[PDB]
């Protein structure tokens, strides 16, 4: 594999199965593969929060949005987005814009691990041999596998909502 | 080698290489498998009837209400054929041709060839591809029959 | 700092009050970036007062308010007549420009942005100051002219109280 | 003892990029930035839920109270700079604590500016 | 870059807006890959309108469950709402693979318009540039023809 070894033992059904049934990674360089993972984790981390946000909003808990609209917004998260006051949406975009600015320009993640937006690499070990720790690779699997599931899950929610209610 | 047959040679009046033939071989075997599944698959809603039944999504106790060779739909089993389409993709993305080192070898999960009866190479590999070619024409000819010449039988 | 891109024959190296007698190369870089950026805002602002006095955009600013581009007053009265959500979204967009594309890299030229072209055309080029010394000076002088004008037009609206013929005698 | 919230890469780069720590900032720039933040924020707690929260103005009162808070904390900073005299912002060969005093004065100016800007936004919009 | 397959003859290096003064060497191939992909789609798109006009609509049923004789679906804009979303999904899927096939990633053989069709592979008789340039030039014509055709079908109302 050579370059895909930098993201090795971190995907597939079982943790050490480089899936890629399209050749999207072969012939690509090490930095490109790392950047591809940075896109994957960022999508998945947002997808995990997106699914959680979808469920806490599709059950009837839209306080900020019921207290701002002065009426219980519809449970359907897609329809509740329209009812949500335009001031709320613009502030929501701005807050994420500040976070995206903050991570990129002032506090950039490293170039070898472009997904360390919190930056554990300066205090983490990741290469020791203890059992009651050094399971960081396993928790990387749980983040990726859960996030990948959340990505297809949230799309299913949006596609079904926008079509078959 | 492999699918070279007996009644004809390389039958290439048009690939004719190594790497390009390998990809074409994967297409050939793949199309062969589906036709054989489809050909025997089409004869079964015939004699032995539209065998199905049991509690299905919007098709509970559906006796395979998708009739005719095309299957039609109208929320009858053919909508459930999309589940066949989806799960067909799962096998097409897990046990696929990108890690399929030979032409169309899936590592023989069933191990039918581990002396259960099939054999490696020789006639069996040639018999699989030759039978696939016959079924592909048969399935296409069966498609013409349902369209403008009545039904299958 | 004579020879820096901003010296023109009408004044040479102006500096009347002597605000940059000492070197303070950091101070000059900051003030030049302000001079260019304030000029560009003023230049876009100066066109923002002239054009509505001739042409108005066809559609509606806020379709779920009845509000159409025509009935918005011109000048420093649209701030209290254009809905606050409208103005907040311009602020959010200018925030994107100031933080994202139009982010002045330290190593780059004073006004150089890493996503804009030779006159600002979106989708860009890295600056070539020596070859483009004519237009870089042209931008500053036009920005310098615009800053005087936009300070005028706003002042004219503040006293006359409109944007019509009286505001610009 | 290094922890994630203080010694992680993000935490270190966030603390270093604060106005109080950002490299290359003149002391008046740090003061101006901190003051703008404080003055803009401090208006809210008074103009809302204040003694005159329901009056027709209800915001000029908040503006005055926020400017008063900014002035009081600036006076406290001046006391600190004339008693402790931090010398981490002084340039070489200057009166000790001059950088801190300049930062505090420009914090007062920035607090006035931020309070006025928040009030202007509230009144206009 | 001034010597690729795009410079035919009637116009030279036609870059009035200066995308090449800063166009990186890989950016050319990326934009060339965009141009080749755009042109090939346009040729397929154009055929897809002029051919159902002269040749009648498909003899068939399109959707075996929702009575689409291909005649209730007009040739032009508005057919997007007439063709089923699944027939739309299935063409989306088919086009989805055609790029999720052998990769067109930067530097890959799929990134310069090469995919393995080889319908017209002349035995290198100084014609590889001819077929390449013809495909690019026709794609440029097809894109312009389509946009006019799209405006023809829209502004008039239907078809041409
Ligand atoms: C934002 C999407 C995204 C991105 C950028 C990545 C990126 C990556 N994945 Mg990944 N993955 C994702 C989503 C994503 N994933 C989802 C949702 C799943 C669940 C099925 C997986 C499951 C998965 C496995 C099981 C494995 C990877 C692996 C990898 C790495 C190898 C590169 C690769 O596979 O192609 C990178 C490029 C892409 C993924 C392109 C995105 C997809 C294109 C645009 C077409 C898809 C469009 C789609 C058909 C239509 C959208 C709707 C759809 C939901 C129906 C790379 C870091 C491998 C790895 O690192 O293991 C060591 C691996 O084994 N992924
Ligand atoms: C992908 C991430 C994501 C995005 C884009 C949104 C976007 C949105 N959410 Mg939301 N939300 C999310 C995750 C997300 N949420 C998560 C993870 C939760 C669980 C705590 C919630 C819980 C939630 C509630 C309870 C409400 C919203 C609402 C809204 C809408 C108005 C903005 C707002 O008040 O947010 C506020 C979001 C929070 C207070 C959650 C903070 C938790 C963060 C993500 C932790 C980090 C907006 C469409 C409001 C609405 O009217 O919905 C239509 C509303 O009342 N969200
Ligand atoms: C998916 C279809 C498919 C594919 C990919 C292949 C691929 C291959 N076949 Mg094969 N074959 C097929 C179907 C297919 N076959 C069928 C159905 C038959 C039965 C008649 C045969 C009979 C056959 C023989 C007897 C031999 C091969 C051989 C080969 C190999 C070399 C031949 C070659 O280069 O052909 C390249 C051909 C093409 C690129 C054209 C593709 C077909 C076009 C698109 C349409 C053909 C006309 C069709 C009937 C009209 C359809 C109408 C429709 C639109 C409605 C290659 C691996 C030879 C071999 O073993 O080599 C080692 C050999 O001797 N095949
Ligand atoms: C190309 C492969 C293929 C495809 C696309 C389909 C697809 C379909 N089959 Mg089918 N089938 C296949 C192979 C295939 N099958 C094989 C190999 C067999 C032999 C076991 C059958 C036996 C079979 C029966 C007995 C019936 C169908 C029926 C159907 C339709 C309803 C789903 C169902 O009950 O399936 C059942 C599928 C299996 C039991 C295969 C395992 C659906 C369109 C039903 C229908 O509506 O009639 C058209 C029906 O009555 N099929
Ligand atoms: C946003 C306000 C602003 C800022 C920060 C600057 C900043 C600058 N101007 Mg400037 N200028 C401005 C508005 C501004 N200008 C306007 C509105 C005019 C029109 C009257 C001018 C006309 C002007 C001239 C004619 C000259 C400068 C020059 C300068 C530079 C040194 C003088 C100095 O420190 O000025 C504070 C400095 C980069 C000098 C220069 O470019 O030196 C190289 C110079 O010769 N300016
Ligand atoms: C008792 C409350 C109080 C206190 C202690 C201060 C304290 C100070 N003010 Mg102040 N100020 C206040 C209320 C207060 N202000 C109010 C209510 C207003 C609104 C009219 C102002 C408007 C104001 C201005 C306009 C200025 C000050 C300035 C100053 C500083 C001299 C000092 C830190 C000056 C300053 O910051 O210069 C460094 C200055 O220019 N103040
Ligand atoms: C961005 C600068 C700015 C702008 C546009 C305004 C705009 C306005 N101010 Mg204001 N103001 C500012 C800075 C600004 N102010 C600052 C820095 C201070 C502190 C000295 C004040 C103190 C101030 C007072 C005390 C009052 C205004 C008032 C007003 C309004 C007349 C108008 C909306 C008046 C108003 O309308 O209040 C309701 C008013 O009474 N402002
Ligand atoms: C997707 C469209 C597209 C793209 C990506 C390209 C890309 C390319 N072309 Mg090209 N071309 C196109 C369409 C396109 N072309 C069309 C339609 C024509 C026919 C007029 C041509 C004619 C042409 C010639 C004659 C030559 C090129 C060349 C080139 C290459 C270098 C020039 C360059 O950077 O262009 C970049 C192109 C773009 C960035 C496209 C931007 C289009 C703008 C945004 C809009 C243009 C107006 C548009 C028609 C408005 C439509 C109205 C609508 C809104 C209603 C590059 C690979 C040259 C070459 O190969 O050099 C070696 C060369 O000699 N092209
Ligand atoms: C060579 C290509 C071509 C051809 C043969 C036509 C042919 C025609 N155009 Mg046309 N057109 C084209 C490209 C083309 N268009 C392009 C690229 C544009 C966009 C710039 C237009 C925009 C256009 C408009 C706006 C109108 C036509 C109209 C017409 C018709 C008179 C005629 C059928 C007229 C028509 O029938 O209405 C749509 C008309 O008013 N054209
Ligand atoms: C809640 C939240 C949070 C927090 C946040 C924050 C903390 C915010 C803040 C904010 C702020 C705090 C803001 C501020 C701003 C400010 C401003 C914006 C200002 C401005 C100013 C100005 C502009 C001024 C000017 C001037 C001067 C300088 C002087 C003279 C006068 C004048 C006026 C000209 C977190 C993340 C934790 C999480 C969750 C969410």
- DSSP per position, D27-80: HHHHHHHHHHHHHHHHTHHHHSSSTTTTSSS-SHHHHHHHHHHHHHHHHHHHHH
A152/B contact by beta carbon, under 8 A: no
Distance CA A57, CA A160 (A): 16
Contacts of D12 in chain A (CB under 8 A): 119, 122
Cβ of C118 within 8 Å of Cβ of E18? The answer is yes
Please report, in angstroms and rounded to a whole number, the separation of the first and last CA atoms in chain B.
Answer: 38
Name the structure determination technique: cryo-EM
Distance CA C154, CA A27 (A): 59
Distance CA E93, CA C57 (A): 41
Cβ burial, residue B77 (10 Å; 0-12/13-18/19+):
buried
Helix H or strand E segment including A39: helix A30-58
Distance CA B136, CA B146 (A): 16
User: Are the beta carbons of D70 and D112 closer than 8 angstroms?
Assistant: yes
Helices (H) and strands (E) in chain A, counts: 5, 0
Distance CA E145, CA E154 (A): 14
| Locus of tokens 């200057």 | D94
Distance CA C116, CA B29 (A): 53
Helix H or strand E segment including A45: helix A30-58
Q: What are phi and psi of C2, to 5 degrees?
A: -60, 135
Cβ of C103 within 8 Å of Cβ of A94? The answer is no
Q: How far is CA B132 from CA A11, B38, B129, in A?
A: 35, 11, 5
Contacts of E18 in chain C (CB under 8 A): 117-118, 125
Distance CA A117, CA A96 (A): 14
Distance CA E49, CA E159 (A): 8
The full DSSP string for E91-160 is HHHHHHHHHHSS---TTSGGGGT--S--SS---SSS-HHHHHHHHHHHHHHHHHHHHHHHHIIIIISS--
- Backbone conformation region of residue A11, classed left if phi is above 0, alpha if psi is from -120 to 50, else beta: beta
Q: What is the token pair recorded at D71?
A: 């002035």
* CB burial string A115-140: b at 16+ within 10 A, e below: bbbebbbeeeeeeeeeeeeeeeeeeb
Q: What is the token pair recorded at A95?
A: 């807050």
User: Are the beta carbons of D12 and A120 closer than 8 angstroms?
Assistant: no
D5/A contact by beta carbon, under 8 A: no
Question: Neighbouring chains of D at 3+ CB pairs within 8 Å?
Answer: A, C
User: Are the beta carbons of E112 and E32 closer than 8 angstroms?
Assistant: yes
Distance CA A12, CA A145 (A): 8
Q: What is the token pair recorded at E73?
A: 């679906």
Query: What sections of E9-121 are H helices per DSSP?
Result: 25-54, 85-100
Distance CA B61, CA B59 (A): 6
Contacts of C125 in chain E (CB under 8 A): 18, 21-22
The shortest CB-CB distance from A119 to any of D3, D9, D17 is to D9
- Cα D123 to ligand 7 centre (Å): 9
* E159 CB-near residues (< 8 Å, 6+ apart): E53, E74, E75, E76, E152, E153
Distance CA D65, CA D43 (A): 7
* Nearest alpha carbon to residue A116 among E60, D9, C10: D9
Give CA torsion, residues A105, A109, A113, A114, to 10 deg. -40
Distance CA A19, CA A13 (A): 8
Q: How far is CA C160 from its chain centroid? A: 24
Helix H or strand E segment including A153: helix A136-162
Determine the Cα angle at C161 with ends C155 and C166, to 5°: 85
CB atoms within 10 A of CB C167: 20
* Nearest alpha carbon to residue A50 among A154, A158, A156: A154
Distance CA C91, CA C97 (A): 10
Q: How many residues are given for chain D?
A: 125
User: Are the beta carbons of E78 and B91 closer than 8 angstroms?
Assistant: no
Distance CA C42, CA C38 (A): 6
User: Are the beta carbons of A4 and A26 closer than 8 angstroms?
Assistant: yes
The shortest CB-CB distance from A27 to any of E85, E101, E107 is to E107
| Locus of tokens 């299935």 | E90
3-state secondary structure (DSSP) of residue A104: helix
Distance CA E82, CA E94 (A): 19
User: Are the beta carbons of E29 and E111 closer than 8 angstroms?
Assistant: yes
Quick one: CA dihedral C153, C159, C165, C168, positive or negative?
A: negative
Query: What sections of chain B are H helices per DSSP?
Result: 19-43, 78-94, 122-148
- Cα D36 to ligand 10 centre (Å): 6
- Backbone conformation region of residue B97, classed left if phi is above 0, alpha if psi is from -120 to 50, else beta: alpha
- Cα D64 to ligand 7 centre (Å): 11
Q: What is the token pair recorded at B87?
A: 């799960």
3-state secondary structure (DSSP) of residue C8: strand
Distance CA E74, CA E57 (A): 9
- Cα D50 to ligand 6 centre (Å): 20
Give CA torsion, residues C99, C100, C106, C111, to 10 deg. -90
Q: What is the token pair recorded at A147?
A: 């996030």
Under DSSP, the state recorded for A130 is -
Q: Is chain B adjacent to chain C, meaning 3+ CB pairs within 8 angstroms?
A: no
User: Are the beta carbons of A41 and A115 closer than 8 angstroms?
Assistant: yes
User: Are the beta carbons of A80 and A73 closer than 8 angstroms?
Assistant: yes
User: Are the beta carbons of A147 and A136 closer than 8 angstroms?
Assistant: no
CB atoms within 10 A of CB B136: 19
* C159 CB-near residues (< 8 Å, 6+ apart): none
User: Are the beta carbons of C141 and C8 closer than 8 angstroms?
Assistant: yes
User: Are the beta carbons of E159 and E153 closer than 8 angstroms?
Assistant: yes
Distance CA B55, CA D32 (A): 71
* Nearest alpha carbon to residue A146 among A138, A135, A158: A138
Distance CA A126, CA A138 (A): 11
Q: What are phi and psi of B76, to 5 degrees?
A: -120, 100
* E72 CB-near residues (< 8 Å, 6+ apart): E82
Distance CA C102, CA C112 (A): 8
- Cα C40 to ligand 5 centre (Å): 14
Give chain A's largest Cα–Cα span. Answer: 59
Distance CA B46, CA B27 (A): 29
| Locus of tokens 């808990």 | A61
User: Are the beta carbons of E49 and E57 closer than 8 angstroms?
Assistant: no
* Nearest alpha carbon to residue B27 among B135, B152, B132, B140: B132
Tell me chain B's radius of gyration from C-alpha atoms.
18
User: Are the beta carbons of A112 and A126 closer than 8 angstroms?
Assistant: no
Residue of E33, E35, E142, E151 best suited for mutating to test ligand 8, as the one with most atoms within 8 Å of CB: E35
User: Are the beta carbons of C112 and C105 closer than 8 angstroms?
Assistant: yes
Q: What are phi and psi of E144, to 5 degrees?
A: -65, -40
Residue of A3, A11, A115 best suited for mutating to test ligand 1, as the one with most atoms within 8 Å of CB: A11
* Nearest alpha carbon to residue A94 among C88, E96, B40: C88
| Ligand 9 close to Cβ of residue E122 (< 6 A) | no
Cβ of B98 within 8 Å of Cβ of A21? The answer is yes
Cβ of B96 within 8 Å of Cβ of A23? The answer is no
The interface residues of chain A toward chain B in range 9-38, judged by CB-CB distance below 8 A, are 13, 20-23
* E127 CB-near residues (< 8 Å, 6+ apart): none
- CA–CA min distance E25, chain B (Å): 30
* Nearest alpha carbon to residue E27 among D87, C42, C125, D49: C125
| Ligand 9 close to Cβ of residue E152 (< 6 A) | yes
B61/A contact by beta carbon, under 8 A: no
- CA–CA min distance D83, chain C (Å): 31
Under DSSP, the state recorded for C69 is G
- Residue identifier of the C-alpha nearest atom 6 of ligand 9: E148
* Nearest alpha carbon to residue D21 among D89, D84, D77: D89
User: Are the beta carbons of C117 and C18 closer than 8 angstroms?
Assistant: no
Give CA torsion, residues A8, A10, A15, A21, to 10 deg. -70
Give CA torsion, residues D24, D29, D35, D38, to 10 deg. -30
- Cα B17 to ligand 3 centre (Å): 15
Q: How far is CA E54 from CA B52, E50, E57, E75, E78, in A?
A: 45, 7, 9, 11, 19
Task: Identify the closest residue of chain D to C84 by CA–CA distance.
Answer: D125
B94/A contact by beta carbon, under 8 A: yes
Distance CA D116, CA D67 (A): 9
Q: What are phi and psi of A115, to 5 degrees?
A: -105, 5
Tell me chain A's radius of gyration from C-alpha atoms.
19
Q: What is the token pair recorded at D9?
A: 């890469």
3-state secondary structure (DSSP) of residue C78: helix
- CA–CA min distance A26, chain E (Å): 9
3-state secondary structure (DSSP) of residue D112: helix
Distance CA E49, CA E82 (A): 15
Q: How far is CA E18 from CA A62, A102, E105, E109, in A?
A: 51, 34, 25, 27
User: Are the beta carbons of D32 and D22 closer than 8 angstroms?
Assistant: no
The full DSSP string for A51-80 is HHHHHHHHTT--HHHHTTTTS---SSHHHH
Half-sphere CA count of A164, side-chain side, radius 13 A: 4
The interface residues of chain A toward chain C in range 57-86, judged by CB-CB distance below 8 A, are 86
Crossing angle between the packed helical segments A136-162 and A30-58, to the nearest 10 degrees: 60
Distance CA C142, CA E78 (A): 49
Q: How far is CA C78 from CA C40, C52, C66, C73, in A?
A: 21, 12, 15, 5
- Residue identifier of the C-alpha nearest atom 25 of ligand 7: D60
* Nearest alpha carbon to residue C115 among C127, C124, C106: C124
Quick one: CA dihedral E73, E76, E78, E79, positive or negative?
A: positive
* CB burial string B82-117: b at 16+ within 10 A, e below: eeeeeeeeeeeeeeebeeeeebbeeeeeeeeeeeee
E96/A contact by beta carbon, under 8 A: no
* A81 CB-near residues (< 8 Å, 6+ apart): A89
- Cα A141 to ligand 10 centre (Å): 39
3-state secondary structure (DSSP) of residue B114: coil
User: Are the beta carbons of A43 and A36 closer than 8 angstroms?
Assistant: no
- Backbone conformation region of residue B102, classed left if phi is above 0, alpha if psi is from -120 to 50, else beta: beta
C79/D contact by beta carbon, under 8 A: yes
A162/E contact by beta carbon, under 8 A: no
Distance CA D43, CA D123 (A): 12
Cβ of D9 within 8 Å of Cβ of A102? The answer is no
**SS3 breakdown of chain B: % helix, strand, coil, rounded to 5?**
45, 0, 55
């Amino acid at each position: 594999r050579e370059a895909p070894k930098v993201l090795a033992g971190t995907g597939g059904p079982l943790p050490e199965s480089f899936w890629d049934p399209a050749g999207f990674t072969n012939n690509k360089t090490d930095e490109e593969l790392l950047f591809y993972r940075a896109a994957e984790l960022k999508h998945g981390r947002i997808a995990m929060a997106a699914v959680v946000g979808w469920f806490t909003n599709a059950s009837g808990f839209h306080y900020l949005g019921d207290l701002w609209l002065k009426k219980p917004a519809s449970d359907n998260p897609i329809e509740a987005f329209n009812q949500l006051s335009l001031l709320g949406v613009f502030q929501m975009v701005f807050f994420i814009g500040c976070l995206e600015w903050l991570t990129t320009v002032p506090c950039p993640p490293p170039k070898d691990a472009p997904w360390d937006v919190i930056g554990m690499s300066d205090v983490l070990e990741e290469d020791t041999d203890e059992n009651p720790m050094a399971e960081y690779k396993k928790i990387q699997m749980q983040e990726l596998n859960n996030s990948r599931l959340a990505m297809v899950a949230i799309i299913g929610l949006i596609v079904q909502a926008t079509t078959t209610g | 080698e492999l699918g070279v047959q007996a009644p004809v040679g390389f039958w290439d009046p048009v690939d004719g290489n190594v790497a390009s033939f390998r990809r074409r071989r994967t297409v050939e075997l793949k199309h062969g498998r589906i036709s054989m599944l489809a050909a025997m698959g089409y004869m079964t809603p015939e004699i032995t009837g539209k065998f199905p039944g049991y509690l299905s999504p919007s098709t509970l106790l559906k006796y395979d209400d998708i009739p005719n060779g095309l299957g039609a739909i109208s929320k009858v089993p053919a909508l459930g054929w999309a589940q066949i389409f989806v799960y067909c993709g799962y096998a097409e993305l897990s046990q696929d041709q990108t890690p399929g080192s030979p032409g169309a070898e899936g590592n023989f999960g069933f191990k039918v060839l581990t002396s259960s009866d099939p054999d490696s190479l020789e006639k069996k590999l040639a018999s699989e591809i030759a039978n696939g070619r016959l079924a592909m024409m048969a399935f296409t000819g069966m498609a013409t029959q349902d369209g403008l010449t009545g039904s299958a039988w | 700092f004579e020879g820096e891109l901003g010296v023109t024959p009408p004044m040479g190296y102006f500096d009347p009050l002597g605000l940059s007698s000492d070197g303070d190369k950091k101070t000059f870089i900051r003030r030049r970036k302000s001079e260019l950026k304030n000029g560009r805002v003023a230049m876009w602002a100066c066109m923002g007062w002239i054009v509505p006095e001739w042409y108005r955009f066809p559609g509606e600013l806020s379709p779920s308010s009845g509000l159409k581009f025509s009935e918005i007053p011109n000048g420093m009265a649209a701030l209290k007549a254009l809905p606050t959500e409208a103005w907040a979204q311009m602020g959010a967009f200018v925030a994107l420009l100031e933080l994202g594309p139009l982010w002045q890299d330290e190593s780059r030229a004073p006004g150089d942005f890493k996503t804009c072209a030779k006159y600002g055309f979106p989708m860009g080029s890295d600056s070539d100051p020596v070859k483009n010394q004519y237009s870089l000076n042209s931008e500053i002088n036009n920005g310098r002219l615009a800053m005087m004008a936009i300070t005028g037009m706003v002042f004219q609206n503040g006293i006359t109280g409109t944007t019509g013929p009286e505001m610009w005698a | 003892v290094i922890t994630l919230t203080e010694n992680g890469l993000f935490a270190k780069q966030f603390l270093s990029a604060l106005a109080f720590y950002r490299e290359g900032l003149k002391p008046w720039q740090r003061g101006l930035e901190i003051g703008m933040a404080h003055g803009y924020f401090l208006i809210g707690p008074f103009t809302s839920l204040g003694p005159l929260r329901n009056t027709p103005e209800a915001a000029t009162v908040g503006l005055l109270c926020g400017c008063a808070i900014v002035g009081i904390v600036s006076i406290g900073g001046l006391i600190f700079g004339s008693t402790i005299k931090p010398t981490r912002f002084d340039k070489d060969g200057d009166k000790p604590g001059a950088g801190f005093i300049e930062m505090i004065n420009w914090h007062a100016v920035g607090g006035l500016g931020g309070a006025g800007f928040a009030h202007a936004l509230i009144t206009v919009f």
